[PDB]
Amino acid sequence: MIVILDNGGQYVHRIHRSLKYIGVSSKIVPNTTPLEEIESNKEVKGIILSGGPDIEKAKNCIDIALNAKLPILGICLGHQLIALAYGGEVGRAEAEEYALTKVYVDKENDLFKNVPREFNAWASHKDEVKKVPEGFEILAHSDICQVEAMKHKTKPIYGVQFHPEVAHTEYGNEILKNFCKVCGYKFE
């Protein structure tokens, strides 16, 4: 089962629904849930940090990003919080409204197994990762965002700027599936 930290975003239930479509159970929990409670439950195989409105109102995620041993995926805010936790930089950007964005995969790693090199994703770009942390690498970019996706070079920590959990994101469920494969799930 995947635990989803609810960072207050409108697509939190869409993460649960999308994971269900690929046969993976998940549980939405408060974003204040302590790390020890998440990792002592032997049913938990990975952690998703959801989108949400307020990078100041999702600090417990920094502790999680730094100290969890389970794989972690951050989505929009989640991705930004991972960047901040490891000493990268985040800031405001221009294209704030949700829109279909053509994403270019620079490193298949994973997130992008069995995903084409180019695909359209549903994304806002009100905020973005300005400086990838040390020890991370960029996986994907768009015309207007240098960091559409990233991961730690060796740890199973992944970030995406866009929302794979909604239908407008092409191959979104396959991106989710790849993260669940890192979590130990198997898929025909």
From Swiss-Prot:
Query: CDD domains under this entry?
Result: GATase1_GMP_Synthase
Q: Which reaction does it catalyse?
A: XMP + L-glutamine + ATP + H2O = GMP + L-glutamate + AMP + diphosphate + 2 H(+)
Which pathway is this protein engaged in?
Purine metabolism; GMP biosynthesis; GMP from XMP (L-Gln route): step 1/1
Report the active site residues: 76 (nucleophile), 163, 165
Q: Which GO terms describe its molecular function?
A: ATP binding; GMP synthase (glutamine-hydrolyzing) activity
What residues does the Glutamine amidotransferase type-1 domain cover? 1-188
Question: What is the main EC category here?
Answer: ligase
Q: Which Gene3D superfamilies match?
A: 3.40.50.880
Q: Which domain of life is it from?
A: Archaea
Query: What EC number(s) does the entry state?
Result: 6.3.5.2
One Pfam family from the record: GATase
Q: What keywords were assigned to this record?
A: ATP-binding, Glutamine amidotransferase, GMP biosynthesis, Ligase, Nucleotide-binding, Purine biosynthesis
Q: Does the keyword Isomerase apply?
A: no
Return the HAMAP family for the record.
Answer: GMP_synthase_A
Instruction: Give a short account of what the protein does.
Output: Catalyzes the synthesis of GMP from XMP.
NCBIfam families in the cross-refs? guaA_Nterm (TIGR00888), PRK00758.1 (NF001975)
What is annotated about its quaternary structure and interactions? Heterodimer composed of a glutamine amidotransferase subunit (A) and a GMP-binding subunit (B).
Name of the protein in question: GMP synthase [glutamine-hydrolyzing] subunit A
